[PDB]
Structures are given as structure tokens and as C-alpha cells.
């Protein structure tokens, strides 16, 4: 339920499966181009464990689709995002999300 | 509602001085091809993604000033409609990215090749990545101005310009018919890599404030001579029709006799033994009488220029003789000078200027004829391709060819002068090449208002590197950015281009400088004196007074100000390091004076008058213009009526006026698929909003333009019409033609009111007010218009997420000009709900105090950053092309205004 | 015009001193300006040349301080920046 688009080719042969932590430098943005989130401002890679649904499912599925070391662009609809409820005070309800995902490494 | 902040990198653009364009009778070719190589690109040197775009841009509005700007800062190629770019995955124009398919599409990586093609014969910009075509072609973009290669880049990139020929190899066969951009280089100059128009450059002693740059124009490549047809040939000219031809029948032949190009009886001209000094009777008859009527043609040029002849002294025929010199001796029918001989004769400067423009009108007719036979310019000569290195107008020609043309006709006018016939100069008419853009002439520089001084003896130096137009002195902090220095009371400035001091008029003072001179400005607020010094010498007024000004009130303060005219470079030395000053010890040090910034750790921040129009609200005390806001009546909606205060009075300000509302409207993000009482559910489910403007009686609709503008519309035109509206269409298809996506972009969506009037014989001043309304559909991006309650054929369609400002452009012709009516129509919601989310369910029109009419002043103040990017531009090699290097990162905090979409 | 016949402002004797002033004040160190300013006051008190000289003898220590006046710091750095200025 998401759309991906590669930006810069990386491995193209390895896929992130269960058992290894997924490490990204992502940059989420609003539908109108209003940047709200990133990791390079924090200057630290974001590590999250694939499998227990701790992150949003659109991001999870997009990261599962795209390979290792390959800079990507994602697009999460409100149906796969926070949607009607919305993130409190950050993301308005029923907002389209755009992600400048960079899966830099696994583990 | 609240301003947003972010950390944004610094983006700069580097261009080669290769300018191309098309016009009627153009001397340039319509197809050009150039490439860019990528050596090293750092993806994320900082938090923000590295910027890198390549493509073309336009010389008449693309000024990417460093720092904040339209959109989200870091403006480069594609951020507006004056440039066309390709980042590696999208086509960039009007600050909108549109994805494009490529065989292995990715953002521009190290060791990649981009093939950029421009066609000027028909609007089309094709792009290829590593030779693989990209299915994107720009269409329907204006040809006015000049086009040039340009690269927009943030820090951390190393790119190479490949221009072909001696300036590159392209590593790929260029498409046929596309001449490499290295062949457009002019002979008077040499190819180099320079940034876009700047206000500062590094200097060996210190940074130089760089005045506006003179820019070449497409109109300067069309040769426009004076027509030499409708001239009846006079008797005194047919009387001298012969000698002035006989003297130019072999004048070009005289130089080379008794050399390797020495004539022979068997052959004739153009056979590497050309001269044939005998006579033109031996020479062929058509070119013979052609040479006669070319002598007549030069005399006809003299007539059209304003030259007339009169005979006074002894006839030169008597006191002239032919000299059989030992040189130029020939065996073919005796020896003689190849032209007709002449004795000692001289020429005055009037004749020098006249023969200069006479050669100009010869060159421009020759170039016009060649163009009419299809030829064009190329720095390398190609005869089968019909291109020449000398097909440029005379003003752009090289000095060698200028002299070579002028020599022959100088001999001709000399021979005319020998016979005593006067060469009469015509009348003198002063003309200016460019007049409309009076503001892109001087770039005022002043310090921050925080450093304003109220006392003490302050001194600073401004080095006048050139001898052009520069003004330096002191001024109050409220200096208007679009008013000349000294024209008002808000400046005490000195101009040493003509020995002039400016304060509320003109009065002689001192002497003009020369190149390299340093002007040290003295000031004593305690003693109420202002003095100027030049190269350690105190400037003198036209009396015993040695002070520029006296009896000055302290007021709100004064500030060190300097300005620079076109083509000017000047160093400002506020004296942060006292040793930097050269003449301070000579003058000022022993007088107790101090440098302006003597004890300041950081260099004083300077502000320059930015030459970029920005919509800002009208001052309430505007002498000429006024906006009337009246409360909405039960029968009429609230309106914003514009009234000209001083119309019909003496010395009124009349000029083209640009107006817009202060708030925009945004379309829906996704477009939908595929008596007199409103319908309650239609009025709640409608997505089209209406406003109108009531063009009052006495205002001519032929000079009224009504419509919409996007916030990036930054064009100021005194003679505005719908032809100059910026537009471009991105056209996309699959890998084999089949164009399936054609989206149009424009900064102005506006309809001329002159097409909405009754085409009567007379009575153009309508007694009934013309009420033109504009309607926008957000759910589809559809723009429609109503003339007098009936729809017109004009309509527009745009992409979602676009913001359009209600704009009415008009040249006033009455005391009552226009009136923004915030009305409504049946089952159509007024703009009061479109502007404000809180009023989205309110059908009643309302005019809240935030919404107010803005007008476009071309010049506004701006800040230059305390640091600038460091770019290394050099010629890496003939095959390597020109290499651009920039690695040091610089980031700035940008405050983004949301509703105006600018930071 | 105003003072063609005679005028104080165009007097050459004072004018030559006006031109010659930078060289005269060039010798003196601006740290001694406290002595200079007090000198006019004691001149106005009708004190002759010898007794103001012994006033300077009694007040040799009354020079200024470069550290407390940052305006003097760059002035004195340029003052010893002059090659003709010896510390003795």
C-alpha cells in the first residue's frame, strides 16, 4: 500500500529479513513539502528492529521492499500511516507522507 | 500561521560566458549542445542533501542571490521560470520537480555524462544521461533574452564543463546539427568560468563590492544599419562619382605588390597573384561598375548619416600627381599606383568618427546580407556549413577587423577631403541603450543600522579601483533603496566621477579621481562637519571652504554609505584593521579621528539594495496612490477600491501599477477523478470561488490586466502585456515518442481587459463600469473568467498544491481606477472562505483586516552573508575541459514565511 | 566679498600654524593628552612658560593609560609602528 522509488543504487541483491536490525538515516516530509523529521539533524543513525511493529507499517513495508545500501524514496498514505488519528501536534490528520529513506546498513 | 526555521546549505551557480539566443535576422545559430562531467559528489556532507543541478538559464531575471529566497532557500537552476534544470531524476522549472524516466535512473553520481541539447529554431531542450535519452522536452518557452550553460551546486561537488572542440571532447558523438557551445565565444573576449551577477568578489587586499554588471542582449546580435535605398543621388555626388571609385578599385591591391602576391599578365584577381594595378577596364565589367556603385553606396551612407559636401579651395586635380614608384613596378601595360594616387592630406576627428560609423554601416549591411543568405557566427570558420568568425555586429567585432575595415574607407574619405569637399558632421542626439531598468544600474551598500553613530570623529576609506560612477559618504539609516543618493535629504554623498557633491541637488566640489584612488571620508558630529579626502589630499570646494558640509543636525544618526554604478569594482575599508588604511596616518590620525569599525571583532555587516521586486503593502501616506476599504453593505459586498490621489493634478506619478492581494489560495492536493437562493448542499460542496474587479468609468480596459499570479512572479514591466508573461510546458512521453504528459507552468494567469469591450467605432471610455470576475476550481486546478456575466474562451489548468495570488495589473487613466470586489455568485462560495480555514463554512463574504492590497516595489534592502563559498574554477585540460571545485560546507538558518512561501 | 579686505579666518599667521599642526602634534605621545588638556586650563589661569614647565616636572606621572582606553591601543600600536619612533 506504499510506493517506492530508488534514488541511488546500492547493493540491489540483499534484502532485510527477520533476525537483523534495520539501520537508516531517514528524512520524513509532509505532503506539501514541509519537512518535519530527519535523522541527520540528530547526527545519529536510527536503528529499529524489524518485526514487532514498533514503527509505522508503511515505513516497515517500504524498508522490507528496498535493498541494502540503496537510497530510496517512499510514500506512505494515511491508510498506512497515523491517518485520521494523526501524530499529536506534529502531523495533521489524513496527511500523505514522503520519505527520503537511506538504508545505510543492517546490524 | 507561524514562521518555520531550518538549517540550509549555501547554493551557488557557475556559468561559462557563452550566450545564445534567437531573433529576426539573428547572427547566431539555433542549435547548441554541451556536456557536464561529475568527478566527486558527497551525498550528505551536512544534514541537508547536496544540491547539484545542470541546465540552461535566461539572462533577464535569473539572479540567484545567495542566502534566503523564494521557496526554501538555496535557489539555483529550476527554482523559477528563468531557468531549466535536471538534477538527475526530475526536470526543474518554476520550483517544481517532475520525475523523468531514464534507463537506470538515479541522482547524478561520480563519473557520469549528461548531454544537454538546446534548439532555438523551435523551443525544445532535450536531455540525455550517459548517452541514454531522457523522455523530457521543454516546450513553449520564450526566446527573449539569452541562453547560457549554468550549474547550480551546493558544497562538496567537483564538476567539469565539456564544451567540445578545443574546450572538451564530449566522450559521446553529439547529435547532428547541434553545434558545440564552445563555438559561440566572441573574439574580443576569452572563454572563462564566472558566477552569475554578484555584489562581492575576493580582492588581494580585501573583498571588493561589485557594482551591477553590463549584460549583453540578443538585440545586440542583429545588425541594424541605416537603410541606403530611398536616397536620390545628388549632382555634386555624380560629379565626383568617378575618382572616389577609381581610388577604391585596387586600393586593397596596392599593399601586396612586389611581394609573394605579385601580379602576372596571364591571370587576374583571386589567383594568389591578385593586384592587376593597370585599370578596372581590364578587370571584369560587373564587379567594375559594382565598385563604382559601391563608391556611390558609401556616399549614400554619408547622405543618410548626415554628410554634405562643399568646395572652397584649389582643385586637387591640378596639384595631384601619379607616382611611378620603384615599388609596385609591373610589366603588364606600364606601372602605376594601384588606386589613384594622392598627396599630403589630413583628417580631423569628426572625419575619424564618421569613417568609423561608415565602416560600421558597411559591416552591418554585409552581415545582414550574409544572414539573409542563411549564414551565422562561429569562432571557427566553416565555409560548407556557412559560418564565419566575423558574422557579429561591428560593435562586437574585434579591433583587428575594425581597423582593417576602417583603413580602406579612411583612405576613401581622405581622397574625398583632398578635393576640398567638406565632410559635414550631422547633428548630435544623445541616446541611452537601456532606459527601462533604471534600478539595475547602481547597487547601494550601507552598514547595519545597529552601528549608527551619534558622536565622535569617524573616518573610513573607499578604494575607487576604477574611474567609473561611484558615490561615497554618509547617510541616515532610513536611506530608501530605490532613490538616488543625495537626491533627497537622507544622504550626504560625494561623486568623484565629475567632481560633484550630492545633497538635495547638485553643486560643484573637488576634482574627479582616477583608477586606484582611495577616498577617505572624514566626519565630526560634535563639530557638525563632513569632509572628504583623496589620496591623502583634502578636497577643496569652490571657495575657501575645505569642508563638504557644515551645520548638520545630529538627528537619528549617520551611516557610512557607498554605491557603485554599472561595471564598477570598489573596495570598502571600514578600518577593522587600522594598518589596512593607507592614508589614515596622512590625514585623520593626528586629528583624533578613528576608523568606523576600529575595535570590532567581527567585520561590520553590510546591506545592499537588492534589485529583486517583492510584493509589500502600500504605505498609508502614499502621495499618489490610495486604497479604499469600505464596510460591506446589504446590497454590495466589501471592496478594495484603488484611487489615484494626484491624478489630474500637476507632476503626478504615472506608471504601470502591479497590484495583488496579500493572501493566496491553495488547490486541493488530489484532483477529483474523471429567487436567486443558493442550494445549501451545493454551496457547502462547491470547490470554485469567485471574485471580481469593477473597472470604473474613465478607466480604459485596454490598459487593464486582471487575473492571478503565483508568489514567485518577480517581474516588473513598465509596458506590461500578456506576451511577456513567463510560461513553459514540460512535455513527456515513453521511450519511443508518444507524448502522454504535457503540463504548463506560468507565474501569471491573467487576462487582458481590452478584449472584453464592445468593438465600437468610438466611445472606448465606457459609461458603464466593466466588472470582470475570476473563478478558481480547487478540486481540479481549473481557472475560468467572466466578462460581464458570460464566460469567455480563456481558461487555464494547473497541477495541485499550487498557490495563486489575486492580481490586477493596470496603468492608471482616471482618479478611480479599479475596485477589488469580494463578491459572490449563485451556488459559488466567495473568497472569504477560500482564504481562511476558520471561515470555510461561512457563505457571507467578509474582508478581515489581514487581507490588504500589496504593490510591487522593484528594490528592497537585503543582507549579505558574513561568509561566502570558495569555488575553484580553472581549465583542467583541453580534453578535461573546465573544472569547478567546491568542498567547504556553509549552512545558514532560514526563517520561512509559509503563506508567501519564501524564506 | 565677506572678508576680502581683511578677515581673521584668512589670516596667514594662524593659517600656517593650522597647516603645520599635524607635525607639531606628531611628536607628542597621545598618552600625554591628559597633560595637554590640563595645560590649556593652567594657561587660562595666567601661568607663564617656566611655571607650567615645572608643573609638568611635578606632574610627569599624569599620563594616560593605554589598557583602560581601548581607543589608545591601536593608536599606540601604530605609534610604535612608525619606524621613526624610538622608545627612548
DSSP string, B49-64: PPPEEEEEEETTT---
Kindly give the interhelix angle for B285-305 and B349-372, rounded to the nearest 10 degrees. Answer: 120
Angle at B329 between CA B324 and CA B330, to 5 degrees: 125
Compute the nearest-CA separation of C22 from chain B (Å).
6
Q: Does B600 touch chain C (CB under 8 A)?
A: no
Q: Is A7 a catalytic residue?
A: no
Task: Note the Cα B855 to chain centre separation in Å.
Answer: 22
Q: Does A35 touch chain B (CB under 8 A)?
A: yes
Among B900, B897, B891, B901, CA closest to B11: B891
Contact assignment for B44 to A25 by CB distance below 8 Å? yes
Query: Which member of A50, A82, A91, A98 is catalytic?
Result: A82
Identify the residue whose cell numbers are 558622536: B455
Q: Does C69 touch chain B (CB under 8 A)?
A: no
Q: Could you say which of B4, B106, B801 has the minimum Cβ distance to residue A8?
A: B106
Contact assignment for A32 to B44 by CB distance below 8 Å? no
Q: Is A100 a catalytic residue?
A: no
Burial class (CB in 10 A: 0-12, 13-18, 19+), B329: middle
Q: Are strands B594-595 and B457-464 parallel, antiparallel or unpaired?
A: parallel
CA atoms within 13 A on the CB side of B760: 7
Q: Could you say which of B4, B47, B107 has the minimum Cβ distance to residue A38?
A: B47
CA distance B687 to B778: 5
CA distance A72 to A81: 18
Angle at B822 between CA B821 and CA B825, to 5 degrees: 100
Among B343, B335, B325, CA closest to B275: B335
Compute the nearest-CA separation of B608 from chain C (Å).
29
Method: cryo-EM
Q: Is A82 a catalytic residue?
A: yes
**Distance (Å) of CA B850 to CA B382, B662, B682, B830, B836:** 64, 8, 28, 17, 11
Among B816, B805, B803, B820, CA closest to B856: B805
Q: Element (H or E) spanning B44, and its range?
A: none
- From chain B, which residues contact A within 8 Å (Cβ)? 4, 6-7, 43-44, 46-47, 49, 72, 89, 99, 104, 106-107, 109, 669, 801
CB atoms within 10 A of CB B659: 24
Query: Which member of A4, A46, A48, A56 is catalytic?
Result: A56
Identify the residue whose cell numbers are 616636572: C57
CA distance B41 to B45: 9
CA distance B708 to B726: 13
Q: Are strands B739-746 and B748-752 parallel, antiparallel or unpaired?
A: unpaired
User: If you measure CA to CA, which chain B residue comes closest to C33?
Assistant: B592
Identify the residue whose cell numbers are 627612548: C88
Q: Is A98 a catalytic residue?
A: no
Contact assignment for A25 to B43 by CB distance below 8 Å? no
Task: Note the Cα C41 to chain centre separation in Å.
Answer: 13
Q: Does A1 touch chain B (CB under 8 A)?
A: no
**Distance (Å) of CA B784 to CA B663, B693, B749, B773, B793:** 20, 15, 10, 9, 9
Angle at B33 between CA B29 and CA B37, to 5 degrees: 155
Q: Could you say which of B47, B107, B801 has the minimum Cβ distance to residue A7?
A: B107
Q: Which three cell numbers stand for residue B771?
A: 466588472
Among B799, B779, B784, B753, CA closest to B691: B784
CA distance B31 to B36: 17
CA distance B334 to B328: 10
Compute the nearest-CA separation of A6 from chain B (Å).
7
Compute the nearest-CA separation of B462 from chain C (Å).
21
Angle at C40 between CA C35 and CA C43, to 5 degrees: 115
Q: Does B594 touch chain C (CB under 8 A)?
A: yes
3+ Cβ–Cβ pairs closer than 8 Å linking A and C: no
Local structure of residue B357 (DSSP, 8 states): H
Q: Are strands B200-201 and B52-58 parallel, antiparallel or unpaired?
A: unpaired
Q: Which three cell numbers stand for residue B139?
A: 516546450
Counting as contact any 3 or more CB pairs under 8 A, the partners of B are A, C
Compute the nearest-CA separation of B515 from chain C (Å).
28
Local structure of residue B618 (DSSP, 8 states): P
User: If you measure CA to CA, which chain A residue comes closest to B96?
Assistant: A33
**Residue B158's beta-bridge partner residues?**
B40, B885
Compute the nearest-CA separation of B589 from chain C (Å).
8
CA atoms within 13 A on the CB side of B197: 24
Q: Does B260 touch chain C (CB under 8 A)?
A: no
Scanning B308-367 for CB atoms below 8 A from C yields none
User: If you measure CA to CA, which chain B residue comes closest to C23?
Assistant: B590
Q: Does B585 touch chain C (CB under 8 A)?
A: yes
B contacts of A35 (beta carbons < 8 Å): 6
Q: Is A79 a catalytic residue?
A: no
**Distance (Å) of CA B589 to CA B2, B58, C22, C78, C81:** 51, 50, 9, 10, 13
Helices then strands, counting H and E runs in chain A, come out as 1, 7
CA distance B227 to B303: 11
Contact assignment for B578 to C22 by CB distance below 8 Å? no
Residues 6+ apart with CB under 8 A from B20: B28, B29, B32, B118, B120, B146, B147, B148, B181, B184
Identify the residue whose cell numbers are 488547490: B667
Most B CBs within 10 A among A4, A26, A28, A40, hence the mutation to make, goes to A40
Q: Element (H or E) spanning B689, and its range?
A: strand B688-695
Contact B765, B758 (CB under 8 A): no
Structure resolution in Å?
3.6
- Can you list the alpha helix ranges (DSSP code H) found in B569-697? 682-685
Identify the residue whose cell numbers are 564543463: B161
User: If you measure CA to CA, which chain A residue comes closest to B108?
Assistant: A8
- Among left, alpha and beta (phi > 0; psi -120 to 50; other), residue B218 is alpha
CB atoms within 10 A of CB B111: 10
Q: Does B537 touch chain C (CB under 8 A)?
A: no
**For chain C, first and last CA: distance in Å?**
52
Contact assignment for C78 to B590 by CB distance below 8 Å? no
Residue B570 phi, psi dihedral angles, 5° rounding: -145, 135
For the CA atoms of B353, B358, B360, B363, the dihedral, rounded to the nearest 10 degrees, stands at -150
Contact B41, B81 (CB under 8 A): no
Q: Does C71 touch chain B (CB under 8 A)?
A: yes
- Can you list the alpha helix ranges (DSSP code H) found in C1-88? 12-27, 33-44, 49-58, 70-79
| DSSP-derived secondary structure for B648-667 | TSTT-----EEEEES--EE-
Contact assignment for A7 to B7 by CB distance below 8 Å? no
Counting as contact any 3 or more CB pairs under 8 A, the partners of C are B
Among C61, C63, C67, CA closest to C37: C63
Counting as contact any 3 or more CB pairs under 8 A, the partners of A are B
User: If you measure CA to CA, which chain C residue comes closest to B596?
Assistant: C71
Q: Is A46 a catalytic residue?
A: no
Q: Which three cell numbers stand for residue B281?
A: 577596364
Contact assignment for B598 to C74 by CB distance below 8 Å? yes
CA distance B88 to B108: 5
Angle at B403 between CA B400 and CA B407, to 5 degrees: 145
Query: Which member of A4, A37, A46, A48 is catalytic?
Result: A37
Among B661, B720, B687, CA closest to B855: B661
Most A CBs within 10 A among B48, B102, B111, B129, hence the mutation to make, goes to B48
Q: Does C20 touch chain B (CB under 8 A)?
A: no
Amino acid at each position: 500500500g506504499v510506493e517506492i522509488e530508488t534514488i541511488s543504487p546500492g547493493d540491489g541483491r540483499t534484502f532485510p529479513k527477520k533476525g537483523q536490525t534495520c539501520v537508516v538515516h531517514y528524512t520524513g516530509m509532509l505532503q506539501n513539502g514541509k519537512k518535519f523529521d530527519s535523522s541527520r539533524d540528530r547526527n545519529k543513525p536510527f536503528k529499529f528492529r524489524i518485526g514487532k511493529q514498533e514503527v509505522i507499517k508503511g515505513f516497515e513495508e517500504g524498508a522490507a521492499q528496498m535493498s541494502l545500501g540503496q537510497r530510496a524514496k517512499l510514500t506512505c498514505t494515511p491508510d498506512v500511516a497515523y491517518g485520521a488519528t494523526g501524530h499529536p501536534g506534529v502531523i495533521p490528520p489524513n496527511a500523505t507522507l514522503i520519505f527520503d529513506v537511506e538504508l545505510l546498513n543492517l546490524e | 500561521l507561524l514562521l518555520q526555521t531550518n538549517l540550509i546549505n549555501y547554493v551557488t551557480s557557475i556559468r561559462p560566458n557563452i550566450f545564445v539566443g534567437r531573433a529576426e535576422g539573428s547572427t547566431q545559430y539555433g542549435k547548441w549542445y554541451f556536456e557536464v562531467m561529475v568527478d566527486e559528489v558527497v551525498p550528505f556532507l551536512t544534514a541537508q542533501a547536496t544540491h547539484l543541478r545542470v541546465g540552461w538559464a535566461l539572462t533577464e531575471g535569473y539572479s540567484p542571490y545567495p542566502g534566503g529566497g523564494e521557496g526554501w532557500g538555496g535557489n539555483g537552476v529550476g527554482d523559477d521560470l528563468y531557468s531549466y534544470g535536471f538534477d538527475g531524476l526530475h526536470l526543474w522549472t518554476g520550483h517544481v520537480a517532475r520525475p523523468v524516466t531514464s534507463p537506470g535512473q538515479h541522482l547524478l553520481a561520480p563519473e557520469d555524462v549528461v548531454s544537454c541539447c538546446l534548439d532555438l529554431s523551435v523551443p525544445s531542450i532535450s536531455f540525455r544521461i550517459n548517452g541514454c535519452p531522457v523522455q523530457g522536452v521543454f516546450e513553449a518557452f520564450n526566446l527573449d533574452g539569452l541562453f547560457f550553460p549554468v550549474v547550480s551546486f551546493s558544497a562538496g561537488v567537483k564538476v567539469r564543463f565539456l564544451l567540445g572542440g578545443r574546450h572538451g571532447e564530449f566522450k559521446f558523438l553529439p547529435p547532428p546539427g547541434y553545434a558545440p557551445c564552445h563555438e559561440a565565444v566572441l573574439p574580443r573576449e576569452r572563454l572563462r568560468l564566472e558566477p552569475i551577477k554578484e555584489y562581492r568578489r575576493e580582492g588581494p587586499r580585501g573583498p571588493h563590492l561589485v557594482g551591477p554588471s553590463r549584460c549583453l542582449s540578443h538585440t545586440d546580435f542583429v545588425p541594424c544599419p541605416v537603410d541606403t535605398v530611398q536616397i536620390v543621388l545628388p549632382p555634386h555626388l555624380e560629379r565626383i562619382r568617378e575618382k572616389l571609385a577609381e581610388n577604391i578599385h585596387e586600393l586593397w591591391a596596392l599593399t601586396r605588390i612586389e611581394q609573394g602576391w605579385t601580379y602576372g599578365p596571364v591571370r587576374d584577381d583571386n589567383k594568389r597573384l591578385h593586384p592587376c594595378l593597370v585599370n578596372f577596364h581590364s578587370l571584369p565589367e560587373p564587379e567594375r561598375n559594382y565598385n563604382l556603385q559601391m563608391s556611390g553606396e558609401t556616399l549614400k551612407t554619408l547622405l543618410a548619416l548626415g554628410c554634405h559636401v562643399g568646395m572652397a579651395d584649389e582643385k586637387a586635380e591640378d596639384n595631384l600627381k601619379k607616382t611611378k614608384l620603384p615599388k609596385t613596378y609591373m610589366m603588364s601595360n606600364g606601372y602605376k599606383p594601384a588606386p589613384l594616387d594622392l598627396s599630403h592630406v589630413r583628417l580631423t576627428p569628426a572625419q575619424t568618427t564618421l569613417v568609423d560609423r561608415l565602416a560600421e554601416n558597411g559591416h552591418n549591411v554585409w552581415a545582414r546580407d550574409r544572414v539573409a543568405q542563411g549564414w551565422s557566427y562561429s569562432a571557427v570558420q566553416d565555409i560548407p556549413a556557412r559560418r564565419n568568425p566575423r558574422l557579429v555586429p561591428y560593435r562586437l567585432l574585434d579591433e583587428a577587423t575594425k581597423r582593417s575595415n576602417r583603413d580602406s574607407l579612411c583612405q576613401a574619405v581622405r581622397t574625398l577631403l583632398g578635393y576640398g569637399y567638406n565632410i559635414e558632421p550631422p547633428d548630435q542626439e544623445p541616446s541611452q541603450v537601456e532606459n527601462q531598468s533604471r534600478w539595475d544600474r547602481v547597487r547601494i551598500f550601507r552598514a547595519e543600522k545597529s552601528y549608527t553613530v551619534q558622536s565622535g570623529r569617524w573616518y573610513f576609506e573607499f578604494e575607487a579601483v576604477t574611474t567609473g560612477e561611484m558615490r561615497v559618504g554618509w547617510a541616515r539609516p532610513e536611506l530608501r533603496p530605490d532613490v538616488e543618493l543625495g537626491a533627497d535629504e537622507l544622504a550626504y554623498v560625494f561623486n568623484g566621477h565629475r567632481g560633484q557633491r550630492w545633497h538635495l541637488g547638485s553643486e560643484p566640489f573637488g576634482r574627479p579621481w582616477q583608477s586606484g584612488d582611495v577616498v577617505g571620508c572624514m566626519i565630526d558630529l560634535t563639530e557638525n562637519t563632513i569632509i572628504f579626502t583623496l589620496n591623502g589630499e583634502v578636497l577643496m570646494s569652490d571657495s575657501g571652504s575645505e569642508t563638504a558640509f557644515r551645520e548638520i543636525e545630529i538627528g537619528d544618526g549617520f551611516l557610512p554609505v557607498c554605491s557603485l554604478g554599472p561595471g564598477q569594482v570598489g573596495h570598502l575599508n571600514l578600518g577593522q584593521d587600522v594598518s589596512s588604511l593607507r592614508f589614515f596616518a596622512i590625514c585623520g590620525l593626528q586629528e583624533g579621528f578613528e576608523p568606523f569599525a576600529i575595535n570590532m571583532q567581527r567585520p561590520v555587516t553590510t546591506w545592499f539594495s537588492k534589485s529583486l521586486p517583492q510584493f509589500e503593502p502600500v504605505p498609508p501616506e502614499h502621495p499618489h496612490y490610495e486604497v479604499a476599504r469600505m464596510d460591506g453593505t446589504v446590497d454590495t459586498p466589501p471592496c478594495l477600491r484603488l484611487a489615484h490621489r494626484t491624478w489630474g493634478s500637476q507632476n503626478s506619478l504615472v506608471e504601470m501599477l502591479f497590484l495583488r492581494l496579500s493572501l493566496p489560495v491553495q488547490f486541493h492536493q488530489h484532483f477529483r477523478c474523471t429567487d436567486n437562493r443558493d442550494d445549501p448542499e451545493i454551496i457547502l460542496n462547491t470547490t470554485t470561488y469567485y471574485y471580481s474587479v469593477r473597472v470604473f468609468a474613465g478607466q480604459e480596459p485596454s490598459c487593464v490586466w486582471v487575473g492571478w499570479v503565483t508568489p514567485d512572479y518577480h517581474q516588473h514591466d513598465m509596458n506590461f502585456d500578456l506576451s511577456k508573461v513567463r510560461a513553459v510546458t514540460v512535455t513527456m512521453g515513453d521511450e519511443q515518442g508518444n507524448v502522454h504528459s504535457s503540463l504548463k507552468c506560468s507565474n501569471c494567469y491573467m487576462v487582458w481587459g481590452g478584449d472584453f469591450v464592445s468593438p465600437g467605432q468610438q466611445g472606448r471610455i465606457s459609461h458603464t463600469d466593466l466588472v470582470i470576475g475570476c473563478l478558481v476550481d480547487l478540486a481540479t486546478g481549473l481557472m475560468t473568467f467572466t466578462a460581464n456575466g458570460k464566460e469567455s474562451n480563456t481558461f487555464f489548468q494547473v497541477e495541485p498544491n499550487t498557490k495563486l495570488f489575486p492580481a490586477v495589473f493596470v496603468l492608471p487613466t482616471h482618479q478611480n481606477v479599479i475596485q477589488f470586489e469580494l463578491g459572490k455568485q449563485k451556488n459559488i462560495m466567495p473568497l472569504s472562505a477560500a482564504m481562511f480555514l476558520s471561515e470555510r463554512k461561512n457563505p457571507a463574504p467578509q474582508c478581515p483586516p489581514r487581507l490588504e492590497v500589496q504593490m510591487l516595489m522593484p528594490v528592497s534592502w537585503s543582507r549579505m552573508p558574513n561568509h561566502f563559498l570558495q569555488v575553484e574554477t580553472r581549465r583542467a585540460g583541453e580534453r578535461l575541459g573546465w573544472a569547478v571545485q567546491c568542498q567547504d560546507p556553509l549552512t545558514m538558518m532560514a526563517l520561512h514565511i509559509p503563506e508567501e512561501n519564501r524564506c | 566679498r565677506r572678508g576680502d579686505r581683511y578677515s581673521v579666518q584668512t589670516s596667514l599667521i594662524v593659517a600656517t600654524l593650522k597647516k603645520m599642526l599635524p607635525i607639531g602634534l606628531n611628536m607628542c605621545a597621545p598618552t600625554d593628552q591628559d597633560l595637554i588638556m590640563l595645560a590649556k586650563t593652567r594657561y587660562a589661569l595666567k601661568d607663564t612658560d617656566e611655571e607650567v614647565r615645572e608643573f609638568l616636572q611635578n606632574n610627569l606621572h599624569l599620563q594616560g593609560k593605554v589598557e583602560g582606553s581601548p581607543s589608545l591601543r591601536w593608536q599606540m600600536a601604530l605609534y610604535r609602528g612608525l619606524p621613526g619612533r624610538e622608545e627612548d
